[PDB]
């Protein structure tokens, strides 16, 4: 599955959003028989932790997932052309690295929990 | 959970599609402490790789999942009675084994990616 | 005015270093956040 892996790394965020399955397929798989086994276990744990997050936001089973959390201009003020047409994901990740623990909290600690309780309350009616 | 496991293996594909949870529950769980541990890790990795595919097609969390990929008569020309009422899954798997890497590509590389972008574009309206 | 160079035995992390100098190991961070106009239903 090492075909096209990270090929879009230098591409803009828009162009690089059409290759998400290429990278996704490359995330998941005697002292020599222990250290490499630990690496395999670590890879599994890392995969599942990201899957656990995606699930905590209602983004389970999705590579592109939208929510009800507004974008705060204090995180980034760039336009949509300066993000998806004139910037790469590496540059964006560097720009937004100070806010990823805030956004994730809003994804988990505000939305989805409210959405799940609201769905629970709409289903009783 | 080893109750009914593969009992439907000799049954027709239709009859054998009502026992999917029976097999699904049996897929997931000092040199002697390493080799068997590697087997356990391997089983986990195999499980997750199939789960990773099911997710790449929008079939996550489903045992029976439908898509928008048409069936090509070049893959099989048999009718629906000759597949679900007069054939087993072992015979079908042997018949279709030359096409599984084409169908999966259509499931990943054509549909779902288009579906996810279309949903992304319908949600902005 | 002058410089003098001598052979050095170094260490063994010099023979292999001369082959591995062009390789770097990185960890993949597949999960990203970005603004779009897409709102959840």
């Amino acid at each position, epitope marked *: 599955v090492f075909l096209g892996f990270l090929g879009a790394a230098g591409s803009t*965020m*828009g162009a690089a*959003s059409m290759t998400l399955t290429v990278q996704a397929r490359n995330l998941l798989s005697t002292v020599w028989g222990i250290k490499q086994l630990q690496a395999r276990v670590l890879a599994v744990e890392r995969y599942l932790r990201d899957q656990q997050l995606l699930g905590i936001w209602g983004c389970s089973g999705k590579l592109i997932c*939208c929510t009800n959390v507004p974008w705060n201009s204090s995180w980034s003020n760039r*336009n*949509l*052309s300066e*993000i*998806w*047409d004139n910037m790469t994901w590496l540059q964006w990740d560097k720009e937004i690295s100070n806010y990823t623990q805030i956004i994730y909290g809003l994804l988990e600690e505000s939305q989805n929990q409210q959405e799940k309780n609201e769905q629970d309350l709409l289903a009783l009616d | 959970v080893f109750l009914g496991f593969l009992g439907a293996a000799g049954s027709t594909m239709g009859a054998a599609s009502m026992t999917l949870t029976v097999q699904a529950r049996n897929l997931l769980s000092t040199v002697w402490g390493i080799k068997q541990l590697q087997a356990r890790v391997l089983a986990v990795e195999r499980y997750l790789r199939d789960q990773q595919l099911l997710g790449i097609w929008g079939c996550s969390g489903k045992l029976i999942c439908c898509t928008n990929v048409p069936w090509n008569s070049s893959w099989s020309n048999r009718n629906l009675s000759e597949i679900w009422d007069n054939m087993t899954w072992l015979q079908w798997d042997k018949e279709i084994s030359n096409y599984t890497q084409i169908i999966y590509g259509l499931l990943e590389e054509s549909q779902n990616q*288009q579906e996810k*972008n*279309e949903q*992304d*574009l*319908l*949600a*902005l*309206d | 005015t002058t410089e003098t160079f001598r052979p050095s035995g170094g260490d063994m992390r010099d023979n292999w270093r001369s082959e591995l100098y062009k390789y770097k190991v990185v960890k993949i961070e597949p999960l990203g956040v970005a603004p*779009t*106009r*897409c709102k959840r239903r």
Partner: antibody
Amino acid sequence: EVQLVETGGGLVQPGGSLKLSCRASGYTFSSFAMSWVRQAPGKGLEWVSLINDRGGLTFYVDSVKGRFTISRDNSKNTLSLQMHSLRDGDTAVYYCATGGMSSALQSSKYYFDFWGQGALVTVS
Amino acid sequence: ALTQPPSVSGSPGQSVTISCTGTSSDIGSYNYVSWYQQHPGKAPKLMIYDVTQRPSGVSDRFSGSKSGNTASLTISGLQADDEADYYCSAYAGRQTFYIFGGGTRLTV
């Protein structure tokens, strides 16, 4: 520099079919959504259909929803409209236009940015 | 359809307002009300988009505004070349999309 040219117009009997085709140049065709808008000889403008930039999402007015098909070929830079079961109420100049929607990764385009000159469709 | 009066007229060098009245589901719900200028015999040209924005190449004499469920086009400094049929349109959701008003034939 942007030019849109409609062709495929003409006189068709009621109940017949007509396919319109809008050629475009001066911009990247695949980067913009396209719409068809019609104007009856004595009326104002009416929106008819909308297709997204990738040609996968199509929208119609109810009066044509089961009769017209909007399609794109992004390699040929060609937009087309297949008009089936033409009614007398469909006589109009049909304009193709650039705009009407955009990708979630693009700024909003809920307007018609560029217009062609229009094909005349007569039903009678 | 949107409500817009016919036969609005001004005078050279003066200001005229073309008022397009809609409902609470379209002009009053989204800030996407465009104005078009169609000379007879020609296709319409885009003059205003969103509420107050102009395409590049369009003179700043064409100023859009919106209040409540009513949108308007103000043309300040009418020219002989401004005689045209003006149209309003608004985005009105996903079940329907663009609702146009009747044309206003503006003379000078």
